[PDB]
Amino acid sequence: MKNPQQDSGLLSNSIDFRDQNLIFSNSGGVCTSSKDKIENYPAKGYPYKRGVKLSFGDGTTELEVEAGGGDDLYGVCSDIDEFSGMATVIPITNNFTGYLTLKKVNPGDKLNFNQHGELEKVSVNAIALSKAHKLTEDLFIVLASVFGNRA
């Protein structure tokens, strides 16, 4: 879940201004162009902050997006609406720069998406811009910039 459902017990201290962005609720990209192409698709599971691939059902229902990668990669999920179950997807043709889920790494390392939509060290897709940041016991995020597919 992008937004922690469990309520906090204390008011936060809005005094500092540094290192207040390394949270899983941060949606979108750190640097965003006004000329970016944005799509929304039905979400299969929870692909938030993961690479997505197109999955077709039996034809009765339209296509949906599922967390995945490899040669089937279609885009990167940057946002998700839980009420409507719609996942915001930026196509692989467009370039994206932001925080993405990392497989549980130093800046400059070339990263490719795995079967579960998680970035991993080495075709390449993106380059690590920072080191792994640990949010939960198994949740690791990383600032990466994706520039498409290139061998």
Partner 1 sequence: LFDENYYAKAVANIIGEVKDPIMYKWFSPDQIEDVDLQMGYQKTVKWDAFLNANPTTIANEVNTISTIGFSSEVVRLNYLKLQYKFRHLKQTSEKFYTSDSYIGDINNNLLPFAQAYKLASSEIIKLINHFVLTGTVSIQKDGKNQKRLLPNMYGLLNMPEQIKEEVASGDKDKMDKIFEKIEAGLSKLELGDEFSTPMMVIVDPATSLKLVKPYAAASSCEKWEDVLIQTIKAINNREDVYIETSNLLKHKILIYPLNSELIKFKPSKYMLPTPNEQVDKDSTDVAHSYIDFVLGGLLATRKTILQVNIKQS
Give the binding site for partner 1 (CB under 8 A): 3, 15-19, 21, 25, 27-28, 32, 34, 79, 81-83, 130
Minimum separation from the CB atom of position 15 to partner 1 (A): 8
The CA-based dihedral angle spanning residues 12, 132, 92, 40, taken in that order and rounded to the nearest 10 degrees:
-30
Q: Please, which residue, 55 or 130, has the CB nearer to partner 1?
A: 130
Q: Please, which residue, 34 or 136, has the CB nearer to partner 1?
A: 34
Minimum separation from the CB atom of position 43 to partner 1 (A): 14
Minimum separation from the CB atom of position 10 to partner 1 (A): 18
Cα separation, 124 vs 151, in Å, equals 6
Q: Please, which residue, 3 or 106, has the CB nearer to partner 1?
A: 3
Minimum separation from the CB atom of position 84 to partner 1 (A): 11
DSSP, res 118: -
Q: Please, which residue, 17 or 56, has the CB nearer to partner 1?
A: 17
Terminal C-alpha separation, the chain:
34
Return all residues near 113 (Cβ < 8 A) that are at least 6 apart.
51, 68, 69, 70, 73, 119, 120, 125
Cα separation, 20 vs 39, in Å, equals 28
